[PDB]
Amino acid sequence: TLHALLRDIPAPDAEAMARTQQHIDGLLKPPGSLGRLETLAVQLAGMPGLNGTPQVGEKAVLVMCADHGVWDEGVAVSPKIVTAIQAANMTRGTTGVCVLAAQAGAKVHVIDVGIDAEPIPGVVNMRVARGCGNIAVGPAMSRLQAEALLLEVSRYTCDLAQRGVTLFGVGELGMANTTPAAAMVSVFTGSDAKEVVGIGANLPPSRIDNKVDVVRRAIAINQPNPRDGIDVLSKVGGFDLVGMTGVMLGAARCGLPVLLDGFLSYSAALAACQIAPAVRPYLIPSHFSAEKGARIALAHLSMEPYLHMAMRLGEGSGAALAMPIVEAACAMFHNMGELAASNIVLP
Amino acid sequence: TLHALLRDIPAPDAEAMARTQQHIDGLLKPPGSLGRLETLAVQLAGMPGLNGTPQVGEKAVLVMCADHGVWDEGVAVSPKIVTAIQAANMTRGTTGVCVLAAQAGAKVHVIDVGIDAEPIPGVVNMRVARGCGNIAVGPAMSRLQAEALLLEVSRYTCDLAQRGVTLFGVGELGMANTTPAAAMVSVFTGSDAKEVVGIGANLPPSRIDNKVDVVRRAIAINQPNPRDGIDVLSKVGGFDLVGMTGVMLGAARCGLPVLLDGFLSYSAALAACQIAPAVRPYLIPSHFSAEKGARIALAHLSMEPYLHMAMRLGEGSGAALAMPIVEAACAMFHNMGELAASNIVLP
Ligand SMILES: O=C(O)c1cccnc1
Ligand SMILES: O=C(O)c1cccnc1
Ligand SMILES: Nc1ccccc1O
Numbered sequence: 001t002l003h004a005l006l007r008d009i010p011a012p013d014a015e016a017m018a019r020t021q022q023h024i025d026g027l028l029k030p031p032g033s034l035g036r037l038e039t040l041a042v043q044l045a046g047m048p049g050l051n052g053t054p055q056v057g058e059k060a061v062l063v064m065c066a067d068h069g070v071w072d073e074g075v076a077v078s079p080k081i082v083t084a085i086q087a088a089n090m091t092r093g094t095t096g097v098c099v100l101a102a103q104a105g106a107k108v109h110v111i112d113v114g115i116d117a118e119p120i121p122g123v124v125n126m127r128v129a130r131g132c133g134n135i136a137v138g139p140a141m142s143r144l145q146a147e148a149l150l151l152e153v154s155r156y157t158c159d160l161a162q163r164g165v166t167l168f169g170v171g172e173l174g175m176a177n178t179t180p181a182a183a184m185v186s187v188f189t190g191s192d193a194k195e196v197v198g199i200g201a202n203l204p205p206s207r208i209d210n211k212v213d214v215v216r217r218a219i220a221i222n223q224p225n226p227r228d229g230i231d232v233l234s235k236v237g238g239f240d241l242v243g244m245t246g247v248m249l250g251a252a253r254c255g256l257p258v259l260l261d262g263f264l265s266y267s268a269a270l271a272a273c274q275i276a277p278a279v280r281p282y283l284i285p286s287h288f289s290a291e292k293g294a295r296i297a298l299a300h301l302s303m304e305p306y307l308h309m310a311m312r313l314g315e316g317s318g319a320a321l322a323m324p325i326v327e328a329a330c331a332m333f334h335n336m337g338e339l340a341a342s343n344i345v346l347p
Numbered sequence: 348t349l350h351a352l353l354r355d356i357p358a359p360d361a362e363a364m365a366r367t368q369q370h371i372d373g374l375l376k377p378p379g380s381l382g383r384l385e386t387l388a389v390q391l392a393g394m395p396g397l398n399g400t401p402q403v404g405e406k407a408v409l410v411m412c413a414d415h416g417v418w419d420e421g422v423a424v425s426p427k428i429v430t431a432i433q434a435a436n437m438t439r440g441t442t443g444v445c446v447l448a449a450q451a452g453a454k455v456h457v458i459d460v461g462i463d464a465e466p467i468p469g470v471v472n473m474r475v476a477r478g479c480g481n482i483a484v485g486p487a488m489s490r491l492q493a494e495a496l497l498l499e500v501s502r503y504t505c506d507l508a509q510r511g512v513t514l515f516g517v518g519e520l521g522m523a524n525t526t527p528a529a530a531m532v533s534v535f536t537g538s539d540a541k542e543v544v545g546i547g548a549n550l551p552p553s554r555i556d557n558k559v560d561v562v563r564r565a566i567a568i569n570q571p572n573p574r575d576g577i578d579v580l581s582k583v584g585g586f587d588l589v590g591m592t593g594v595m596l597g598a599a600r601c602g603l604p605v606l607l608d609g610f611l612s613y614s615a616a617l618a619a620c621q622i623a624p625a626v627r628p629y630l631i632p633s634h635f636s637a638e639k640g641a642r643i644a645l646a647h648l649s650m651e652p653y654l655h656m657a658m659r660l661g662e663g664s665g666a667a668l669a670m671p672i673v674e675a676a677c678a679m680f681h682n683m684g685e686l687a688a689s690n691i692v693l694p
């Protein structure tokens with residue numbers, strides 16, 4: 001079922017992209033002057049789920065929530081229960097993603113893939129377990145659990161496409177999750193833990209060393225295979241991370257765009273592209289995370305974010321903030337006048 | 348009258364800013380996690396025209412249009428008449444700024460400060476002359492003309508504030524205007540012309556040398572005084588550039604924020620800050636222009652743009668694109684829930 005899914009990811013439509021580029025070149029402006037907005041418009045035009053043109057219909061931010069066993073290693077200063085509390089707030093519209101998504105006209109879908117607490121009413125239930133295993137002493141989960149969640153989340157994502165959603169945004173919520181994120185980045189990029197381990201949610205500078213040590217132990221003990229994204233996710237990842245990877249595989253299979261968020265999302269995207277390179281064309285960066293390993297992770301994905309906001313909240317907040325930018329590419333494409341109609345000729 | 352104006356620019360309200368910072372720190376998120384969005388919110392709170400809080404009411408983009416005598420030196424490949432044509436399109440909603448401003452819910456005000464063509468119906472008439480003097484052989488205009496336009500535009504800007512406008516965006520339109528922009532940047536920053544002269548609207552690489560030469564001649568012949576922003580503007584600037592400087596002085600006097608656009612706007616802001624350092628606190632960067640001298644100009648203004656879009660259209664298009672970001676800071680500030688209300692305590 002997963003092989004089928006990965007097999008059916010459509011390649012971008014080069015024909016629609018060429019038509020788009022020609023149309024953009026003819027707009028009321030010096031050719032190429034709107035830079036990355038032009039490039040983004042063309043990219044969108046190549047996505048089969050969008051009907052050959054840069055269009056944006058309904059918008060959704062999927063937030064994957066889960067707890068992590070590695071929290072017990074003292075790698076995070078936020079109380080573990082904050083995952084459960086914030087997930088509930090996500091249903092009240094008071095969180096950072098909620099407020100930014102509301103501003104963008106997007107709906108937030110809160111999905112519980114493994115919070116260590118009783119079920120929260122109003123949150124989508126796809127709970128694998130009450131938190132994943134502590135990666136410092138063994139794997140986060142079984143390969144089977146990782147594959148099942150990928151399928152599950154993937155289907156949910158592409159099913160939203162049937163409800164008019166054309167643009168996705170991915171996000172997470174899970175105390176201590178910048179630890180497995182860093183382990184994955186280290187593994188996929190071949191970078192040393194010290195180079196990609198950050199302060200997460202205000203970790204005191206004095207406790208960084210321990211965090212770096214925990215990441216190295218996780219890798220040494222699990223021996224994840226860099227060439228197998230599912231192996232890496234199941235061993236040194238987490239449920240929230242697997243879920244984000246699933247949103248990306250689902251949107252790609254649906255031929256639709258997905259906006260990345262910050263550091264946690266970069267880790268998930270490295271996994272997704274490792275598992276299926278065909279996913280890459282559908283990914284759109286949003287902002288440049290203030291987390292230490294962001295530069296390395298983005299360099300390996302060959303992505304240059306549009307927004308430099310020193311943000312490090314997570315939740316899909318950056319994804320929501322960039323949605324207007326995607327709408328701008330559409331507006332540009334469909335609403336600008338044409339040079340020829342004004343009798344203007346430029347070399 | 349100009350001395351009065353400059354004298355009456357209010358300092359930022361430190362009391363409102365402290366109250367803002369405390370409120371932001373108490374929001375549902377790790378302290379400081381929304382980074383530059385938090386900083387922007389505080390900055391807005393200190394602006395007297397906004398009522399002690401980051402608020403955005405009506406939005407306006409002021410586009411200053413004028414022609415330049417230096418066009419005759421072969422520094423621009425766009426036909427001179429494009430200024431007049433595009434200014435007319437600005438009244439039809441088909442231009443790049445129009446489309447992006449519409450997306451942001453802002454109104455575009457097109458102001459003719461010196462187009463070399465017959466008056467265009469629908470465009471605000473503040474025409475100094477039919478194009479400014481060719482800076483390669485003498486000054487763009489008299490000091491008197493520069494001061495009069497500054498006053499004129501300044502009053503117009505702050506008068507809009509009485510109509511509910513709380514956020515301004517500045518833009519321009521004028522063939523060959525990246526030449527005087529570069530001369531001004533060179534003068535204010537002490538950088539050599541070759542380091543700040545760019546391709547403007549697709550100038551062929553083979554004609555760059557001539558453009559660099561024209562900039563040096565302009566400076567040698569006029570001998571503008573770097574410590575006198577009005578001297579520089581009148582000698583090696585242009586009507587559109589003076590006008591943009593005027594919007595900045597007017598918004599500051601009104602105690603309101605102004606969003607910069609690209610390279611031309613950076614030149615105008617260097618002049619504005621030279622003339623009145625008190626203007627600085629009211630300036631908000633938008634994007635990082637793809638023009639060659641952008642880095643140097645931004646470094647001298649100590650500004651780090653939020654958007655990296657490789658844009659180089661001008662017209663205030665970048666300013667419009669960043670307006671949602673300013674609205675996001677307000678949304679964050681007013682709509683997020685508080686940590687205490689959720690019983691969350693973080694170190
Ligand atoms: O980049 C992120 O999304 C991030 C960084 C630190 C802590 N939480 C989220
Ligand atoms: O940065 C700008 O605004 C710009 C650069 C080149 C040509 N026109 C405008
Ligand atoms: N629209 C346009 C066209 C040519 C040169 C500059 C411009 O802003």
Ligand SMILES: Nc1ccccc1O
Nearest residue numbers: 078086201375376377
């Ligand atoms: N709201 C929040 C609080 C603590 C840690 C991470 C979060 O996203």
